[PDB]
Design a protein around this ligand. Structure first.
Ligand SMILES: Cc1cc2nc3c(=O)[nH]c(=O)nc-3n(C[C@H](O)[C@H](O)[C@H](O)COP(=O)(O)OP(=O)(O)OC[C@H]3O[C@@H](n4cnc5c(N)ncnc54)[C@H](O)[C@@H]3O)c2cc1C
Ligand SMILES: Cc1cc2nc3c(=O)[nH]c(=O)nc-3n(C[C@H](O)[C@H](O)[C@H](O)COP(=O)(O)OP(=O)(O)OC[C@H]3O[C@@H](n4cnc5c(N)ncnc54)[C@H](O)[C@@H]3O)c2cc1C
Ligand code: SF4
Ligand code: SF4
Ligand code: SF4
Ligand code: SF4
Ligand code: SF4
Ligand code: SF4
Ligand code: SF4
Ligand code: SF4
Ligand code: SF4
Ligand code: FES
Lengths: 664, 137, 446
């Protein structure tokens, strides 16, 4: 009895009136159960139409309004604003599509039938509108901090972008230094710029920025919460050496680790260096290389013998604490960016290339470290077998890639063609008279200035044999490598003699990346990389709200593409922080806990993990995280007990439409 | 001249957009099917379809998005499970399971929407009125 | 040192420009979205499907397009051009040419003084216009009137009119009576706005393949380019999505794809670079012909199939599995039979090492991409340099792919170099962030 509904029918200027009797529709609507006024007008998407709607609202005191007009996706915001201007809730408005679905498809010889269909549509719309409630828009506050996991070029770029946007940001790096893979590269294709030179300003900018907390040598222990508020627990690994800030906080005025290096000079323990791919010695207390952002000299506790000589080497500064353990910090962030990067696929498998059993077979990262001036040698590429300079280097492209055998990877690694060309150029430049052979199977120079780079590499004298390497033997006397394949162009078998063989191995996610992406509720892709919110129109986002992806952890990329992805992720993460609120969907699900039975079937039924099972008044019931719900309606349509309320699309309102369809 | 009574429940993002596009392209089809316009066609409970059939529906059509094209990424699979079980139920209760169907219309297929309307109308006219109306409901 | 106006300008309403404008608006900055064409959609609105997920292009783009129009922080100036830009990163005084739309929006009609709204989009005007011209959205293959829209799913649906082709008979005026949306005597308007930063997203066009005479693109009637094939294969194209031969309208059973058409060429006619996506939409076209036309076979005359991205190689595997033939040889030349306009493609299959002459009912050239016309003039208006390849130059090739040497100007999309849609969107978001930095700080030092 209480609901009073007003029905307004648009002619659309003979677009609707030319196919059906508008007078019949109005005279029929005048007799529906809850109808105070029924009116017709020519163009109700115009200002006089809104004026008439408001006048009718005021003068009949309508509870709700039904407009028989074009599709809701065309003019629903228009009429919602019209109804709101007039003293009614925006979501109290209902629309009957009588143009795109009744008048433009029933033109010829269907006059009574089109009018009858219009009557039915208006009846169903009025039936739904008689049961519409008030949806007050509500939002969730956003913590004004951001977290970036991974200190590589993507993580560094995202952190700098978020900081320069005015947002306090945490940069979480597993290693004692941030630089990442870019720090390991000697040169960069196709410009041949020095990698450390172009990256050092970025590293010092990250180190100096007041809006970035650069927490290195630490990782994520656990994560809870949603887009509004992520409670993230981090473990600070026992660094063993104090920064000057930490030294002052500890109590001693003596600074902590100005980076002199005396401790490493006196340490008696020798261990491999992960930064140099294990080809260089390092002490228990060490730095990765000279150009590390935090120059703080980590100590390797599982290799240290606690001989206590580094402490005398560091006297009057007291930077070394040999007996401290990992700390735990609880940080409250608003959004998160994942930039975990990549590692090399283990090419010790795929036995026909003797990566581990032949000494002069190396991978691409080892080659980069060996040819860089800061590597184990003075930038002089030498054979690991005897230290003599090579004159003949082969490059095996696609090593473990585009492989469907189940050992390698079925995808392309994107950059192995380009850095193989860069390596060929570097060997042909640094060693005079050396010849580079590239055993290739689809040279892929797709990026800007990449084809020109390929042309230049061929012009400088590199040999391109179009054939995937079949197998590799080695001569016992001289540890040179026989490479057996076919030159498919020229159509002949080929056995190439090389002093050095470099495998362009595939790339895979870093170890522990899958555990991290599970910790944030991010699904993997069918290649094993992190999945995207939409492969086309949202390369940065993720199904879980407030989490964004940047860099090769989303998929192998070049440095420029990685930086573009990182900046996009930073922008997407900054948007909710800048706004300060996340507006909830107008039509989220609500659990009526008086009807929930705590079965928990619906929990695994939401794509966005909004639904969870939690206590309330001592009863186990379902809890809806409104920040994650998107109004899909899957849960509400499943629950047998009807304990989930899909507002504006509730079971009573939909059944009311179905009931009115079979009414008079 | 008995007039068929077909009810449609079409998702907002693909099927409703497809019907709008068909209307925009002036594609003609008989005026027999009326729509409901849920958000995701995963909103469709089985009780909706069963209530429609009990109340006197002659045929029921549910239209969603192609697999992998749902706006909410998983709704049409839940809908597909529910509609498969619905087809089982209508066969095993003695109803003609061909009175009900679920189509996958994208937002670019207006002609497909018109073809679906024609096919549904023809099938329901062939099957005749629902038996449930004769038996005291 | 100098204040920054809390406004931004995005030139180009393509997917890059749309994404940049949406990102800037969501950050809270008032943004101008400047579009040359009457609609914003861009090249992505012309595609039928998208590699490698085979999703429909309009369906994904329609929500993003609807948002730009509704968004209150974005003023969407379509059918407008940038006349002049003066100033610097602090204040950019940009004067814009609102070309004569010929039809008023309801806001403009209200401002004029008439209560009658302007152009609800009924389309009655186009039903009476007696002039028939080619449609640039279908680009010469479908008819359109003097007053028209590019397609049905246009963001601003206001039915522009081409005054260079209109005869001013006034029949559309009577077709639109009582709304008064059509004013046949209106002309260009000059507006001045002040913006803090600018984002350039001008996009790309097709390289003119009337040259390379060995492929009779404009000579033989059944030789088409990639975008013509996309328009022909889309269900909303000139036909009902049925790929038919332009020569006689019959359904082809056999079509060839000439990859690298005008690409990786050092002869001075084509382009010396790779267009970075020819291979993938060629594979997509092969899939579409094999699915739509039963028994039709695709031949791809290729050279270094380049499926480098995420799920690109698996798409290649699927295409080969569906039965696509891959002949590794650049097409030497093309002849046609005078009687039945079939196309003889002469090349070598370098694998198998033999000369090859392949009959095809249809031939599709995967032409290289080029900067749009007038993009160099606009690039000079903002003081941006060009690359050696002719694309707009970035500040640093590695660590600043979006910024330029000139302050306050940022690049996004194919205007910086050919890219896929996800790469374009990532670049657009990065450019939006770089433009938002000075506005959010509200001050820069020079
Ligand atoms: C041999 C070789 C040569 C190359 N040459 C070039 C070239 O010339 N030009 C070019 O443009 N590109 C080149 N590339 C590609 C380039 O290295 C990548 O594009 C780039 O490094 C990717 O950036 P990223 O920061 O995402 O990767 P990464 O640097 O790997 O980022 C990962 C970072 O996050 C940290 N991290 C990982 N997991 C965790 C965790 N769980 N918690 C915390 N921190 C974590 C890592 O320690 C690291 O600091 C080359 C690649 C290789 C392998
Ligand atoms: C045949 C073909 C098939 C493709 N298929 C796919 C596919 O399946 N999947 C995929 O991911 N990618 C595909 N692509 C690539 C895709 O089209 C591009 O990545 C994308 O269009 C780039 O978007 P953009 O906005 O930068 O370009 P555009 O859409 O060209 O953006 C330029 C826009 O700005 C406007 N504009 C230009 N100059 C000016 C000016 N001076 N003033 C004002 N406005 C201006 C233009 O009118 C246009 O609206 C395909 C490309 C082609 C050619
Ligand atoms: S509301 Fe819709 S049907 Fe009515 S005049 Fe406006 S566009 Fe036409
Ligand atoms: S000796 Fe002390 S100050 Fe010197 S590098 Fe080691 S920790 Fe730092
Ligand atoms: S205590 Fe450990 S780190 Fe220090 S010198 Fe001895 S072995 Fe090296
Ligand atoms: S980038 Fe080149 S070498 Fe690496 S997998 Fe792809 S085709 Fe093979
Ligand atoms: S809402 Fe329904 S399905 Fe979910 S736990 Fe409660 S009773 Fe079970
Ligand atoms: S409506 Fe969809 S997203 Fe929201 S709680 Fe239900 S299933 Fe989850
Ligand atoms: S006839 Fe008038 S109202 Fe209709 S589309 Fe043309 S200008 Fe707009
Ligand atoms: S005045 Fe121009 S646009 Fe209007 S009907 Fe005549 S030719 Fe067409
Ligand atoms: S993308 Fe493929 S077809 Fe296009 S130029 Fe590059 S290799 Fe040739
Ligand atoms: S939105 Fe249509 S199937 Fe889910």
């Amino acid at each position: 009895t209480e609901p009073r509904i007003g029905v307004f029918v648009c002619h659309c200027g003979t677009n609707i009136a030319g196919s059906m009797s508008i007078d019949d529709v109005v005279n029929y609507a005048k007799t529906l159960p809850y109808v105070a006024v029924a009116d017709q007008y020519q163009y109700m998407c115009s200002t006089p139409g809104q004026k008439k709607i408001d006048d009718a609202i005021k003068e009949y005191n309508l509870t709700g309004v039904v407009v028989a007009a074009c599709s809701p996706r065309l003019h629903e915001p228009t009429f919602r604003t019209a109804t709101k201007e007039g003293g009614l809730n925006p979501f109290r408005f209902e629309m009957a599509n009588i143009r795109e679905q009744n008048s433009w498809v029933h033109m010829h010889g269907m006059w009574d039938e089109a009018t009858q269909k219009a009557k039915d549509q208006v009846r169903m719309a009025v039936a739904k509108a008689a049961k519409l409630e008030d949806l007050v828009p509500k939002s969730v506050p956003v913590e004004k901090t951001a977290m970036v996991v991974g200190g590589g070029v993507a993580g560094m770029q995202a952190a700098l972008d978020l900081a320069s946007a005015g947002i306090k940001t945490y940069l979480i790096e597993r290693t004692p230094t941030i630089g990442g893979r870019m720090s390991q590269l000697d040169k960069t294709f196709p410009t041949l710029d020095c990698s450390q030179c172009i990256l050092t300003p970025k590293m010092v900018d990250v180190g100096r920025h007041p809006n970035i907390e650069m927490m290195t040598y630490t990782e994520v222990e656990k994560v809870e919460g949603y887009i509004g508020n992520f409670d993230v627990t981090l473990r600070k690994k026992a660094r063993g050496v104090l920064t000057p800030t930490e030294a002052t906080a500890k109590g001693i005025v003596g600074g902590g680790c100005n980076g002199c290096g005396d401790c490493s000079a006196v340490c008696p323990v020798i261990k491999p260096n992960p930064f140099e791919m294990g080809m260089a010695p390092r002490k228990a207390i060490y730095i990765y290389h000279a150009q590390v952002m935090p120059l703080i000299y980590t100590v390797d506790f599982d290799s240290c013998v606690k001989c206590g000589l580094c402490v005398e080497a560091c006297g009057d500064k007291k930077a070394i604490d040999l007996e401290m353990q990992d700390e735990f910090i609880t940080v409250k962030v608003g959004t998160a960016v994942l930039a975990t990067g990549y590692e090399l696929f283990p090419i010790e498998n795929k036995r026909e290339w003797g990566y581990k059993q032949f000494d002069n077979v190396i991978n691409a990262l080892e080659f980069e470290r060996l040819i860089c001036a800061s590597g184990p040698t003075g930038g002089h590429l030498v054979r690991p077998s005897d230290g003599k300079t090579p004159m003949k280097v082969g490059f095996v492209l696609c090593a473990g890639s585009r492989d469907n055998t189940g050992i390698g990877k079925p995808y392309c690694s994107r950059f192995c063609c380009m850095y193989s060309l860069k390596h060929a150029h570097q060997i042909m430049e640094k060693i005079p008279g050396a010849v580079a052979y590239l055993f290739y199977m689809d040279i892929r120079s797709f990026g800007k200035m990449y084809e020109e780079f390929y042309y230049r590499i061929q012009h400088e004298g590199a040999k391109f044999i179009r054939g995937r390497v079949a197998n590799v033997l080695e001569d016992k006397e001289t540890k040179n490598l026989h490479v057996f394949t076919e030159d498919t162009l020229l159509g002949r078998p080929v056995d190439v003699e090389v002093d050095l063989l470099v495998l362009a191995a595939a790339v895979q996610p870093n170890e522990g990346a899958n555990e991290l992406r599970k910790k944030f509720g991010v699904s993997a892709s069918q290649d094993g990389w992190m999945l995207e919110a939409h492969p086309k129109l949202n390369p940065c986002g993720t199904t879980t709200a407030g989490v964004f992806l940047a860099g090769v952890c989303q998929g192998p990329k070049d440095i420029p593409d990685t930086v573009a992805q990182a900046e996009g992720a930073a922008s997407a993460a900054s948007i909710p922080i800048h706004m300060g609120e996340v507006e909830l969907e107008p039509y989220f699900a609500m659990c009526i806990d008086e009807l929930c039975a705590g079965c928990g079937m619906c929990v695994n039924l939401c794509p966005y993990s909004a639904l969870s099972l939690g206590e309330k008044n001592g009863r186990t019931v379902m809890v809806v995280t409104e920040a994650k719900c998107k109004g899909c309606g899957t849960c509400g349509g499943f629950c047998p007990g009807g304990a989930i309320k899909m507002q504006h699309f509730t079971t009573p309102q939909i059944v009311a439409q179905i009931d009115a369809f079979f009414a008079g | 001249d008995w007039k068929p009574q077909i009810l449609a429940i079409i998702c907002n993002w693909c099927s409703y957009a497809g019907a709008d596009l068909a209307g925009g392209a002036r594609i003609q089809y008989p005026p027999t099917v009326r729509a409901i316009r849920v958000m995701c066609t995963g909103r469709v409970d089985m009780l909706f379809i069963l209530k429609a059939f009990v109340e006197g529906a002659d045929g029921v059509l549910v239209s969603g998005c192609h697999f992998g094209d749902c706006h909410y990424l998983e709704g049409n699979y839940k809908a597909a499970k529910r509609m498969f079980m619905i087809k089982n139920l209508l066969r095993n209760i003695g109803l003609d399971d061909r009175r009900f169907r679920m189509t996958f219309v994208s937002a670019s297929e207006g002609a497909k929407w018109g073809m679906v309307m024609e096919d549904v109308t023809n099938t329901i006219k062939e099957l005749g009125p629902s038996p449930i109306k004769e038996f005291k409901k």
